[PDB]
Design an enzyme around this catalytic site. Structure first.
Site, PDB file in Angstrom:
ATOM      1  N   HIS A  47       0.790  -1.248   0.000  1.00 19.34           N
ATOM      2  CA  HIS A  47       0.000   0.000   0.000  1.00 19.34           C
ATOM      3  C   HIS A  47       0.784   1.238   0.000  1.00 19.34           C
ATOM      4  CE1 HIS A  47       0.565   0.365   4.353  1.00 19.34           C
ATOM      5  NE2 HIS A  47       0.497  -0.966   4.294  1.00 19.34           N
ATOM      6  N   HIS A  58       7.736   7.235   3.465  1.00 25.36           N
ATOM      7  CA  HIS A  58       6.766   6.763   2.465  1.00 25.36           C
ATOM      8  C   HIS A  58       5.878   7.946   2.131  1.00 25.36           C
ATOM      9  CE1 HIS A  58       4.675   6.311   6.235  1.00 25.36           C
ATOM     10  NE2 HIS A  58       3.600   6.676   5.544  1.00 25.36           N
ATOM     11  N   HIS A  91       1.657   9.043   0.626  1.00 23.76           N
ATOM     12  CA  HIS A  91       0.276   8.770   0.305  1.00 23.76           C
ATOM     13  C   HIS A  91      -0.083   9.696  -0.855  1.00 23.76           C
ATOM     14  CE1 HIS A  91      -0.275   6.771   4.299  1.00 23.76           C
ATOM     15  NE2 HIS A  91       0.690   7.590   4.624  1.00 23.76           N
ATOM     16  N   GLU A 122      -3.234  13.200   3.352  1.00 22.25           N
ATOM     17  CA  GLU A 122      -4.008  12.709   4.546  1.00 22.25           C
ATOM     18  C   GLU A 122      -4.438  13.899   5.375  1.00 22.25           C
ATOM     19  OE1 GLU A 122      -1.673   9.219   6.085  1.00 22.25           O
ATOM     20  OE2 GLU A 122      -3.423   8.357   5.060  1.00 22.25           O
ATOM     21  N   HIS A 161       5.652  11.169   4.519  1.00 28.02           N
ATOM     22  CA  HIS A 161       5.776  10.875   5.951  1.00 28.02           C
ATOM     23  C   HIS A 161       7.199  10.372   6.220  1.00 28.02           C
ATOM     24  CE1 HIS A 161       1.197  10.410   6.406  1.00 28.02           C
ATOM     25  NE2 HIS A 161       1.597  11.667   6.413  1.00 28.02           N
ATOM     26  N   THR A 177      -1.782   6.422  10.623  1.00 30.27           N
ATOM     27  CA  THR A 177      -2.934   6.647   9.758  1.00 30.27           C
ATOM     28  C   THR A 177      -3.369   5.388   9.007  1.00 30.27           C
ATOM     29  OG1 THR A 177      -1.628   7.269   7.840  1.00 30.27           O
ATOM     30  CG2 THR A 177      -2.250   9.079   9.391  1.00 30.27           C
ATOM     31  N   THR A 178      -2.726   4.264   9.232  1.00 26.04           N
ATOM     32  CA  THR A 178      -3.152   2.982   8.711  1.00 26.04           C
ATOM     33  C   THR A 178      -3.248   2.034   9.885  1.00 26.04           C
ATOM     34  OG1 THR A 178      -1.125   1.790   8.274  1.00 26.04           O
ATOM     35  CG2 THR A 178      -1.669   3.323   6.639  1.00 26.04           C
TER      36      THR A 178
HETATM   37  C1  V26 Z   1       6.311   3.042   8.879  1.00 21.51           C
HETATM   38  N1  V26 Z   1       5.329   2.629   9.890  1.00 21.51           N
HETATM   39  C2  V26 Z   1       4.019   3.061   9.876  1.00 21.51           C
HETATM   40  C3  V26 Z   1       3.706   4.412   9.570  1.00 21.51           C
HETATM   41  F1  V26 Z   1       4.757   5.204   9.404  1.00 21.51           F
HETATM   42  C4  V26 Z   1       2.440   4.962   9.498  1.00 21.51           C
HETATM   43  S1  V26 Z   1       2.009   6.659   9.124  1.00 21.51           S
HETATM   44  N2  V26 Z   1       1.199   6.692   7.770  1.00 21.51           N
HETATM   45  O1  V26 Z   1       3.255   7.347   8.948  1.00 21.51           O
HETATM   46  O2  V26 Z   1       1.178   7.007  10.270  1.00 21.51           O
HETATM   47  C5  V26 Z   1       1.408   4.050   9.776  1.00 21.51           C
HETATM   48  F2  V26 Z   1       0.132   4.456   9.673  1.00 21.51           F
HETATM   49  C6  V26 Z   1       1.635   2.732  10.190  1.00 21.51           C
HETATM   50  F3  V26 Z   1       0.598   1.969  10.501  1.00 21.51           F
HETATM   51  C7  V26 Z   1       2.942   2.221  10.232  1.00 21.51           C
HETATM   52  S2  V26 Z   1       3.098   0.507  10.666  1.00 21.51           S
HETATM   53  O3  V26 Z   1       4.524   0.108  10.615  1.00 21.51           O
HETATM   54  O4  V26 Z   1       2.454   0.301  11.955  1.00 21.51           O
HETATM   55  C8  V26 Z   1       2.193  -0.391   9.431  1.00 21.51           C
HETATM   56  C9  V26 Z   1       2.914  -0.506   8.092  1.00 21.51           C
HETATM   57  C10 V26 Z   1       2.967   0.713   7.264  1.00 21.51           C
HETATM   58  C11 V26 Z   1       4.167   0.975   6.666  1.00 21.51           C
HETATM   59  C12 V26 Z   1       4.276   2.061   5.834  1.00 21.51           C
HETATM   60  C13 V26 Z   1       3.236   2.989   5.668  1.00 21.51           C
HETATM   61  C14 V26 Z   1       2.062   2.836   6.431  1.00 21.51           C
HETATM   62  C15 V26 Z   1       1.951   1.706   7.177  1.00 21.51           C
HETATM   63 ZN    ZN Z   2       1.938   7.581   6.217  1.00 21.57          ZN
END
Ligand code: V26
Ligand code: ZN
Length: 258
Positions: free
Chosen positions: A62, A92, A94, A104, A117, A196-197
């Site tokens: 994602h 990463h 979005h 977001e 982010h 946010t995920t």
């Molecule tokens: C890198 N870890 C991370 C994250 F940074 C965010 S965010 N969007 O910055 O709050 C998430 F929402 C998030 F859910 C995670 S996670 O590692 O727990 C689950 C895995 C994942 C990895 C990369 C992007 C989103 C979620």
């Molecule tokens: Zn993010």
């Protein structure tokens, strides 16, 4: 039937698996710029990325993640609203299907084309997995992207995306300097929030920069050629991987400026 970014598995469904989705400090939020409180106690953000050591880029299904070696005291975020030292682990984005959506966070309801982010964990918890179990475990620096002139420091990321098109693909990604992704100003808004995920843990101090970076249409177009699916599955373009704004509830957004 895992969570994702569609009708039957998108943000409006996440609460069934992750009930904290309806919690008291969820992210993202709309930033009301007129209601945000200038806080003269807030410090300049200290972003120290000169020794950052990127290692690899990964399509996790994602997003794509640029990962750093976080086993030494290298790339750190401090100051601002933060009490400790937070170490960069990855970044990463979005983004949207169209230039008019993708961020977001929103600013007076404005949606940007994308949001970067930069994710950091509090060194007092020893590693990322312990940090996400704490209310002050993470600091995420959020940067808006608008479409206009190209971001030259982004192109090395864009060019490697064809090698990680599908879920689970990785590629070596050394010597990438994340200072090339930062706007001129470090003026920011800050508030306590969440991932946010899923798993949506309430562990994040959000620091959202006021100044967006410009990227070109061709750069964001290449983000949109990525795929949520794995190789040999029906193609689902990786677009609209953003959570909409959540209720602010009992929170104050603070501004470092004005
Ligand atoms: C890198 N870890 C991370 C994250 F940074 C965010 S965010 N969007 O910055 O709050 C998430 F929402 C998030 F859910 C995670 S996670 O590692 O727990 C689950 C895995 C994942 C990895 C990369 C992007 C989103 C979620
Ligand atoms: Zn993010």
């Amino acid at each position: 039937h895992h969570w994702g970014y569609g009708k039957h598995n998108g943000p409006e469904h996440w609460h069934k698996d992750f009930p904290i989705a309806k919690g008291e400090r969820q992210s993202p939020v709309d930033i009301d710029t007129h209601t945000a409180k200038y806080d003269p106690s807030l410090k300049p953000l200290s972003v120290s990325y000169d020794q950052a050591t990127s290692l690899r880029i990964l399509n996790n299904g994602h997003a794509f993640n640029v990962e750093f070696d976080d086993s030494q005291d290298k790339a750190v975020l401090k100051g601002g609203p933060l009490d400790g030292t937070y170490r960069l682990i990855q970044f990463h984005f979005h983004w949207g299907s169209l230039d008019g959506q993708g961020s977001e966070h929103t600013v007076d309801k404005k949606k940007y084309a994308a949001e970067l982010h930069l994710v950091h964990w509090n060194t007092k918890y020893g590693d990322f997995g312990k940090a996400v179990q704490q209310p002050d475990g993470l600091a995420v620096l959020g940067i808006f992207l608008k479409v206009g002139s190209a971001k030259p420091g982004l192109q090395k990321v864009v060019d490697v995306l064809d090698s990680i098109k599908t879920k689970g693909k990785s590629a070596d990604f050394t010597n990438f300097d994340p200072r090339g992704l930062l706007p001129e100003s470090l003026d920011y808004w800050t508030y306590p929030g969440s991932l946010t995920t899923p798993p949506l843990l309430e562990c994040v101090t959000w620091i959202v920069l006021k100044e967006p970076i410009s990227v070109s249409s061709e750069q964001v177009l290449k983000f949109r050629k990525l795929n949520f699916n794995g190789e040999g599955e029906p193609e689902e373009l990786m677009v609209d991987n953003w959570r909409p704004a959540q209720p602010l509830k009992n929170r104050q957004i603070k501004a470092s400026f004005k």
